Design a protein around this ligand. Structure first.
Ligand SMILES: CC(=O)OCC[N+](C)(C)C
Lengths: 234, 270, 223, 338, 56
């Protein structure tokens, strides 16, 4: 099975250093481009760094540029994240995210288990209009996301990604590229859009489907998540 | 009278048509797009430059007697001609080295030679020719402080100094032809079966290319080594034909290097 | 202008390009030998010291050899013989003690003449014009024990020499190399196999060294 | 009793031949005299897929008309994104001697086979992210020459032991064996409803089989050499053949005889691959004289030449929507034409 | 070898037992299928480069 175990987090002083390590098992690690996605205890997801397959292309977020560096070791299947000059804004939960890119691929398919860290302007903005919806099971709930610019590229792809974070574990991929259903996810979830306005139609809502829903865009780096729409009972 | 210009113009025409046919044979025929043929393309480039501009400027110099273009143009065209002529010789020398290592090391060397290392050899030969000839020809009149060459005449200024003429001629022709002789003797010696027609064909090809280079190049070199001792020894018309003789090597280089292969011969006929 | 997904797909395609190029560079320094012969002609007795196609891989003098056996293919030969067009050399095995035996499938037919017909089809094929043939003539001990009991004239009616080992062996050796049409284009190397070790692989190594030298002469434009 | 059976077979052959003669009221050339010619078909090379380092023997288009798989003798099965010339996958085969390749209509599987007598099925959509073997089909004793998918679980293969076999991928066993050909089978093509398939062999005969009951329905003759290529018409009521005698012939499944012969005097080289257009108006054939002719399938006239290859055009494919034609060849190049 | 001849003559009897249509009707509806799908074939008529996946 695909497994990503993370370690190295804990308690650090401000301005200190700590090295993160994401151990990979159950998949061909050398052909997957890895990510790091950070989640604050109160806020949502935030992309940090990305290393490509073969370490050819490396990006960073503007908040963490220069301070953090990302490296991978394909022979021993370990993804690293060396952190320098840690501040109080880095007190959060870290995930290593599996991703591959070809025609028809499903990036951000699997997410790591997660390790926590405690420290003692032209980007596209993903806005979710609602933060919490009280909904009963058996009903059809619609979740909407908005974009600053049009996510429709000239090749026809609309790079919109939907995620669901159940309370207790990692987020999981639901819809990749606006309309394509993922693997292992039920058929009830449906997604559609129109370049700038997007929606996610869940029908015949079950009980395990509650949690926080996020939108994301892959049109241009840096990768910006949504605020987070939460579904709860009653 | 008019016979000199007709013969020289016809020979220059044969040179440029032969070199572009070598270029179009490598370009059009995908079977000739080989690492070994990139050296032949590098040699065709030098010979096309020689047959287009070097031959025609020197023949109008002969039929008029006085260089009419000026002194700046004289030193630029001497820089261009000598650099591309030494580039031609160095192309022949890296082809001899390529062939020697393919025969003597048939298992290892074709694996080690790639297009990057072939481009490195081509670039090394061209810059070495440029470094050897172009700073000397264009700076001599300045560093010395005098212009020995008259306005009407166009020729190398440092031929009066014997030591520079000895060293430059040995590094341009004498040392390269000794190295090619030793390598091609070893190529013909190591081409025979060790387990007939092969040795005869190879020896015939090697004798063809070696005599073509030696005959078209040795007169000028022995002429410049005696000129530096006695200027008046060598008649002007002798000098003119000994100079133009060097250009003939470029004309007959398609026939000796390219047309031996049977794939070129079908491409030339098309 | 490419997307971020498109740029990462192009990077994946370029990594696939460099992997294909290094695999081709490893495959380019590989001696591909197509083994041929007839049934029970000592085809399998030379692979011990050196269904479908059986490939034998071995190293000798820091050179890796790919030897392909297609004797198990009972289909029509010309529909797949062009797949071996780029082989370095062809190993042909002919039994020396097969000059006086009849095919089991067809009566009144010598297997020596059948192997001669196979050699005529292989040597003069349009796909194998330039490829040299390493001809192996094996089982010389049984041939030496058989040539005293049985004359060679029952195989070749035009034979007039004595019934000794060396004269008859050289006669049938020349009777195999006179089939070649393009004597200039391709060579035929001939070895008599012995029970002593490493002689056959040394002959194969010397023959493919000569073939590689001739191919380098062809590529360099000397020949 | 053996002579009586041969006499009965000869009498049935005469009955078949004059039943075919009885229904031959008119030829295809007489009916299509008044139709307009297609004109000069001028198709340019739009993409060139470089990456193979040996002779490309077979390619197969995807049903999305964008992805295509290709096989070559260097031991590499490569899936191409033909829109951007990107290589999606590069499958390293265990046996480099492959003569055919297939692409599943769902898209999750590819097949290949050749001189190893094994049809290997590769799983594309894998959770591990790499393409792996899923099932190796062993059963044939002759070389595999062509194989097409029915769906994700059924694949039919034509082999060099004069037999065609219907396989079950999950069990790994063959369910139906099609026997009747005397020459080695070189190609098969399947009907659009996937209920019948024609099959060309080396005995110059084309046999129409039934996938279900597994019996040969009809046998078509008219060629003089080894048939190397076969392809249905888009309606499934006709098919075309290609052989070593430098001609292409169109058959009818209902009239059960010859319709049209596609040959020219200066063409003396065999046909390695045939394909139809989306409307079936153009018949395309890959010859051995390094070219690819475009035939007006209703008028038997050459309409264009896809001259762009420096070696023998070994394979030919047309997209399901008819946008593009891909011509693989022995010069390690795939060329997309439009 | 008698059983092989019996199977062969049974196969020829099965092939002779089928029904066949006139060749003119096969030519007619083959021509009809070619003419009905003529607009959907982009290799016949030149497709514009705006909707060409390869020219554009
Ligand atoms: C010696 C040298 O490098 O070039 C001599 C050729 N020449 C006389 C035509 C310029």
């Amino acid at each position: 099975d695909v497994q990503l175990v993370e370690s190295g987090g804990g308690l650090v002083q401000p301005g200190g250093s700590r090295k993160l390590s994401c151990s990979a098992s159950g998949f061909a690690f050398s052909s997957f481009g890895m990510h790091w996605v950070r989640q604050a205890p109160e806020k949502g997801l935030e992309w940090v760094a990305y290393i490509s397959s073969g370490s050819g292309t490396i990006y960073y977020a503007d908040t963490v540029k220069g301070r953090f560096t990302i490296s991978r070791d394909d022979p021993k299947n370990t993804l690293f994240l060396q952190m320098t000059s840690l501040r109080s804004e880095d007190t959060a939960m870290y995930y290593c995210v599996r991703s591959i890119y070809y025609y028809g691929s499903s990036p951000f398919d699997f997410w790591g288990q997660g390790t926590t860290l405690t420290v003692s302007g032209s980007d596209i903005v993903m806005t979710q209009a609602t933060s919490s919806v009280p909904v009963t099971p058996g009903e059809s709930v619609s979740i909407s996301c908005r974009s600053s610019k049009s996510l429709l590229h000239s090749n026809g792809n609309t790079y919109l990604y939907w995620f669901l974070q159940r309370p207790g574990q990692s987020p999981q991929l639901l819809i990749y590229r606006m309309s394509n259903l993922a693997s292992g996810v039920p058929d009830r979830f449906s997604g559609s859009g129109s370049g700038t306005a997007f929606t996610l139609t869940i029908s015949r809502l079950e009980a395990e489907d509650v949690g926080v829903y996020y939108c994301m865009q892959h049109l241009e780096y840096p990768l910006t998540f949504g605020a987070g729409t939460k579904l709860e009972l009653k | 009278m008019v016979f000199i210009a007709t013969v020289t113009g016809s020979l220059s025409l044969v040179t440029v048509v032969g070199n572009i046919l070598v270029m179009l044979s490598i370009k059009v025929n995908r079977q000739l797009q080989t690492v070994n043929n990139y050296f032949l393309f590098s040699l065709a480039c030098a010979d096309l430059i020689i047959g287009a501009f070097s031959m025609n400027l020197y023949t109008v110099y002969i039929i008029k007697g006085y260089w009419p273009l000026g002194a700046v143009v004289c030193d630029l065209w001497l820089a261009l001609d000598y650099v591309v002529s030494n580039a031609s010789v160095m192309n022949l020398l890296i082809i001899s080295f390529d062939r020697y290592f393919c025969v003597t090391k048939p298992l290892t060397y074709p694996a080690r030679r790639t297009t990057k290392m072939a481009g490195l050899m081509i670039a090394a030969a061209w810059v070495l020719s440029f470094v050897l000839w172009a700073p000397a020809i264009l700076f001599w009149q300045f560093v010395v402080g005098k212009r020995t060459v008259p306005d009407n005449q166009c020729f190398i200024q440092f031929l009066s100094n014997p030591a520079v003429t000895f060293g430059t001629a040995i590094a341009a022709f004498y040392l390269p032809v000794v190295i090619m002789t030793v390598l091609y003797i070893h190529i013909s010696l190591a081409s025979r079966s060790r387990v007939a027609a092969r040795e005869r064909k190879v020896t015939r090809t090697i004798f063809a290319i070696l005599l073509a280079f030696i005959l078209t190049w040795t007169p000028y070199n022995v002429m410049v080594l005696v000129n530096t001792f006695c200027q008046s020894c060598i008649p002007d018309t002798v000098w003119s034909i000994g100079y133009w003789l060097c250009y003939v090597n470029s004309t007959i280089n398609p026939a000796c290097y390219a047309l031996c292969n049977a794939t070129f011969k079908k491409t030339f006929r098309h | 202008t490419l997307s971020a997904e498109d740029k990462a797909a192009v990077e994946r395609s370029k990594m696939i390009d460099r992997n294909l190029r290094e695999d081709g560079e490893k495959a380019a320094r590989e001696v591909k030998l197509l083994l041929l012969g007839a049934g029970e002609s000592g085809k399998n007795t030379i692979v011990k010291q050196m269904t479908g196609i059986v490939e034998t891989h071995f190293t000798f003098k820091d050179l890796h050899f790919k030897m392909f056996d297609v004797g198990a293919q009972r289909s029509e030969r010309k529909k797949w013989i062009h797949c071996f067009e780029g082989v370095t050399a062809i190993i042909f095995c002919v039994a020396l003690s097969d000059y006086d035996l009849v095919l089991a499938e067809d009566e009144e037919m010598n297997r020596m003449h059948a192997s001669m017909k196979l050699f005529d089809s292989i040597c003069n094929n349009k796909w194998f014009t330039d490829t040299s043939i390493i001809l192996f003539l094996n089982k010389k001990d049984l041939f030496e024990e058989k040539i005293k009991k049985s004359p060679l004239t029952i195989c070749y009616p035009e034979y007039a020499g004595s019934n000794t080992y060396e004269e008859a062996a050289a006669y049938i050796q020349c009777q195999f190399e006179d089939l070649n049409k393009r004597k200039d284009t391709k060579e035929i190397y001939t070895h008599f196999t012995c029970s002593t070790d490493t002689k056959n692989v040394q002959f194969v190594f010397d023959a493919v060294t000569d073939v590689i030298i001739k191919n380098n002469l062809k590529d360099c434009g000397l020949f | 009793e053996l002579d009586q059976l041969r006499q009965e077979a000869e009498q049935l052959k005469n009955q078949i031949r004059d039943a075919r003669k009885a229904c031959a009221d008119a030829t295809l050339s007489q009916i299509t005299n008044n139709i307009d010619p297609v004109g000069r078909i001028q198709m340019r090379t739009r993409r060139t897929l470089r990456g193979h380092l040996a002779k490309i023997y077979a390619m197969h288009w995807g049903t999305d008309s964008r992805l295509l798989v290709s096989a070559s003798q260097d031991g590499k099965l490569i899936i191409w994104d033909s829109y951007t010339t990107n290589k999606v996958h590069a499958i390293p085969l265990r046996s480099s001697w492959v003569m055919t390749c297939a692409y599943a209509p769902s898209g999750n599987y590819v097949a290949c086979g050749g001189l190893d007598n094994i049809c290997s099925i590769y799983n594309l959509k894998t959770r591990e992210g790499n393409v792996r073997v899923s099932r190796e089909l062993a059963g044939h004793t002759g070389y595999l020459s062509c194989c097409r998918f029915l769906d994700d679980n059924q694949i039919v293969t034509s082999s060099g032991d004069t037999t065609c076999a219907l396989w079950d991928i999950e069990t790994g066993q063959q369910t139906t064996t099609f026997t009747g050909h005397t020459g080695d089978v070189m190609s098969l093509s399947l009907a659009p409803d996937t209920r019948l398939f024609v099959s060309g062999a080396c005995d110059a005969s084309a046999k129409l089989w039934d996938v279900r009951e597994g019996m040969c329905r009809q046998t078509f003759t008219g060629h003089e050499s080894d048939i190397n290529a076969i392809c249905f018409f888009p309606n499934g009521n006709a098919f075309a053949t290609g052989s070593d005698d430098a001609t292409c012939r169109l058959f009818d499944l209902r009239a059960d005889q010859e319709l049209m012969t596609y040959s020219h005097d200066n063409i003396i080289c065999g046909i390695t691959s045939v394909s139809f257009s989306k409307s079936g108006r153009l018949l395309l054939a890959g010859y051995d004289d390094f070219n690819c002719n475009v035939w007006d399938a209703l008028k038997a006239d050459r309409a264009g030449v896809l001259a762009g290859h420096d070696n023998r055009v070994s394979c030919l494919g047309v997209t399901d929507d008819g946008m593009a034609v891909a011509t693989g060849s022995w010069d390690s190049f795939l060329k997309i034409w439009n | 070898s008698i059983a092989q001849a019996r199977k062969l003559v049974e196969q020829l009897k099965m092939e002779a037992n089928i029904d066949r249509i006139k060749v003119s009707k096969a030519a007619a509806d083959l021509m009809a299928y070619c003419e009905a799908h003529a607009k959907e074939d982009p290799l016949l008529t030149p497709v514009p480069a705006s909707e060409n996946p390869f020219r554009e």
